[PDB]
Scaffold this active site. Structure first.
Site, PDB file in Angstrom:
ATOM      1  CD  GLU B  42      85.685  38.930  57.247  1.00 28.23           C
ATOM      2  OE1 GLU B  42      86.079  39.750  56.523  1.00 28.23           O
ATOM      3  OE2 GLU B  42      85.289  39.282  58.538  1.00 28.23           O
ATOM      4  CG  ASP B 152      85.872  36.578  63.915  1.00 28.94           C
ATOM      5  OD1 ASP B 152      85.698  36.791  65.042  1.00 28.94           O
ATOM      6  OD2 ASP B 152      86.315  37.458  63.100  1.00 28.94           O
TER       7      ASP B 152
END
Ligand SMILES: [Cl-]
Lengths: 250, 249
Positions: B42, B152
């Site tokens: 991200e 993730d």
DNA sequence: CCGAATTCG
DNA sequence: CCGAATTCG
């Protein structure tokens, strides 16, 4: 005369696009068919004022005057009003209720009821509860009256079975008439584009229930209305209306 | 010595609030621990630019650098970059992919991998499909290469089993170490309040997989990072990072 | 990035 | 007003 006609129609006041043109479209159908009674769902206060101008031959009885609500129009000179009553749905999260209007029509007494039962798949449990309240009040209504319920039920066929089926003394007019195909689906995203849903879905959300003495109320016909697309390329509503004529004997 | 350290951290570049403060927080952590490798998820383009300045002791490897993406940082004078490769997730609806970087570190060949698998419980099926692709590419890497995935995964309980469980030669570093509770949850709305979620939810969304020959790669430690709340009153991210040291035999 | 309420093609 | 995508406490 010994015949009565009505329209039940969710006119989708919560869709703000082309609302004035769509309201005019609805009033066209009302002028075209001139039913004795109209059951409307999803009326908003502006839509309600549009009706008092271009449908002036009807008396408007409403289940609220804020947010969105249902209404029952009574043809002046043909139906005479007696009383009204609003049975709440204590557990609605969408401000739904049950509107009851007692009238005299062609010399006979009638208890006219409409409602917009809780919407969407995810509210199946409350929708079933509200259906039981409606059917309960249909049976509790005075023995001397004929009861007609017409409204947007949002029902799936499975949910009426889960609910026990209609009582033996309450009839679905479409069923009574032989479940005719031409007016089965009152909400159809393939034939109707107002909501801009790409997928094709169809449902018989709009239903007519009645309770009468044996042979005293006999459906004659059921037809879709609101089928003519308007000048703006959209229909009056995302629902079709139902136009029903019934004979009253005795 | 024959040891490697790395961090994996979703730094939530999509949270606009206090992003400059928070990026300063991330870099200050990276400088306290100074790991050999950092896997970030991200990241966004101004966050990445910021890293190239304040994290100049690292080479930043990225993919498209469009939208939000992942990155892998390599500490100069310790990790020698060799190649990179982006594997697509053909059915992703969230622009996710698998970033792979081949490096030389302490004389051994590593294939470092990271990704940010499809999010939310509703997309369980695509997540599992992406997991199969990740485990796939770990299997197909040369045998003389140490393969470490860190990212993730957004994986829930039961989703790894419904996928068929891990291969026999792929270990989860947290499982290998005995499932220590001190670093079980990497996303905890009770202990981390950045998202302002009223309810308490805890998940081990961030995971380290490695494929190594019997006894060639032994996890030494695994700790959370980003635990210090910042001056602005929030955490660097809504995720805790993971700090891991492995010994190579 | 939870998940219930809301939006939207 | 379908039902996947978005939103926000
Ligand atoms: Cl037409």
């Amino acid at each position: 005369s010994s015949t009565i006609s009505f329209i039940t129609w969710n006119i989708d006041g919560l869709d703000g696009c082309n609302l004035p043109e769509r309201a005019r479209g609805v009033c066209s159908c009302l002028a075209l068919y001139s039913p004795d009674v109209v059951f409307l769902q999803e009326v908003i206060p502006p839509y309600c004022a549009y009706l008092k101008k271009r449908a002036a031959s009807y008396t408007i009885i409403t289940g609220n005057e804020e947010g969105y609500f249902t209404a029952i129009l009574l043809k002046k000179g043909r139906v005479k009003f007696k009383s009204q009553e609003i049975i709440p749905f204590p557990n609605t999260k969408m401000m739904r209720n049950l509107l009851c209007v007692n009238v005299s029509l062609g010399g006979n007494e009638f208890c006219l009821m409409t409602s917009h039962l809780e919407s969407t798949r995810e509210h199946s449990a409350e929708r079933i509860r509200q259906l039981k309240t409606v059917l309960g009040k249909m049976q509790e209504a005075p023995d001397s009256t004929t009861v007609i319920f017409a409204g947007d039920t949002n029902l799936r066929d499975q949910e009426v079975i889960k609910c026990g089926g209609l009582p033996d003394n309450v009839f679905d007019a479409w069923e009574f008439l032989g479940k005719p195909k031409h007016c089965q689906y009152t909400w159809d995203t393939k034939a109707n584009n107002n909501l801009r849903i790409p997928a094709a879905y169809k449902h018989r959300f709009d239903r007519i229930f009645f309770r009468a003495e044996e042979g005293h109320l006999i459906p004659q016909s059921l037809d879709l209305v609101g089928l003519e697309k308007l000048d703006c390329g959209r229909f009056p509503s995302d629902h079709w209306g139902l136009l029903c004529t019934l004979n009253v004997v005795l």
